[PDB]
Amino acid sequence: TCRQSMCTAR
Amino acid sequence: IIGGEFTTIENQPWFAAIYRRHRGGSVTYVCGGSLISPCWVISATHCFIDYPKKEDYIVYLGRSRLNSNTQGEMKFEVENLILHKDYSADTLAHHNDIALLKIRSKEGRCAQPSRTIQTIALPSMYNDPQFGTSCEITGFGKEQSTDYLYPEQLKMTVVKLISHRECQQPHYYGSEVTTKMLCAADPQWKTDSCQGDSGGPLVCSLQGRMTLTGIVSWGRGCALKDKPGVYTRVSHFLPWIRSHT
Numbered sequence: 101t102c103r104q105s106m107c108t109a110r
Numbered sequence: 111i112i113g114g115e116f117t118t119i120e121n122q123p124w125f126a127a128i129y130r131r132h133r134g135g136s137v138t139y140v141c142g143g144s145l146i147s148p149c150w151v152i153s154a155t156h157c158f159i160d161y162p163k164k165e166d167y168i169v170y171l172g173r174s175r176l177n178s179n180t181q182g183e184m185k186f187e188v189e190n191l192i193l194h195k196d197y198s199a200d201t202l203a204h205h206n207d208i209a210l211l212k213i214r215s216k217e218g219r220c221a222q223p224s225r226t227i228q229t230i231a232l233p234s235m236y237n238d239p240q241f242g243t244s245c246e247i248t249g250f251g252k253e254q255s256t257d258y259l260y261p262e263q264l265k266m267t268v269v270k271l272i273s274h275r276e277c278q279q280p281h282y283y284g285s286e287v288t289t290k291m292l293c294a295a296d297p298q299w300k301t302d303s304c305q306g307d308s309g310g311p312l313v314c315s316l317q318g319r320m321t322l323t324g325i326v327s328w329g330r331g332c333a334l335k336d337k338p339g340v341y342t343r344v345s346h347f348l349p350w351i352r353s354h355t
């Protein structure tokens with residue numbers, strides 16, 4: 101499951 | 111950090127650089143953190159959640175450069191890695207994104223304060239600066255969204271706190287942002303935290319003292335218009351922190 105939060109994580 | 115300035119650890123002496131060891135002996139930078147007592151660094155759970163094995167991590171204090179030994183630096187193992195049990199990642203937001211690392215040198219000692227290694231104060235309960243206040247962020251994160259490498263030299267920048275009311279607007283983050291988070295950005299959207307800055311400090315001069323107000327957590331892109339950095343609001347987690355510390 102890809103979630104956008106994987107990318108928002110800094 | 112997008113924009114801002116290069117800095118050195120003397121200006122940010124509470125900054126902890128957190129690395130992960132790999133099987134073959136290679137070490138990669140993971141996240142930032144902040145020294146809140148001699149034995150405790152505070153960071154973000156999302157940095158560690160996929161690899162929660164404390165033996166994998168190295169923590170440096172007094173370190174200004176990513177891949178070199180700065181004079182007076184101290185190296186630590188992690189004696190206890192405590193992640194927030196209610197951590198979760200949704201569409202955009204990371205909730206309860208806070209972690210504690212109990213640090214210990216090979217000789218079994220905690221941090222020794224010096225010009226380049228100092229603790230940072232925690233805020234009191236629910237006590238944050240007013241929106242509009244300038245605060246600083248520190249990190250080894252990306253200098254541009256398109257970079258795949260981190261800068262060798264530590265950076266800092268200064269951003270302004272944004273109200274919950276503004277941050278929850280539809281073109282900002284809507285209902286993804288909660289009262290346990292803090293938004294901060296540049297009014298002209300030219301400087302921000304970015305990937306690689308996660309876990310590190312948002313520090314505000316509060317009531318006559320440098321205070322850990324936030325922890326770098328998440329954001330939509332880096333330095334994008336109407337998309338602030340989002341920080342774990344440390345002043346809403348004091349019971350959790352003191353319970354584990």
Ligand SMILES: *Cc1cc(C*)cc(C*)c1
Pocket residue numbers: 102103104105106107108
């Ligand atoms: C699945 C997904 C979607 C976006 C927009 C970003 C990432 C990292 C993952």
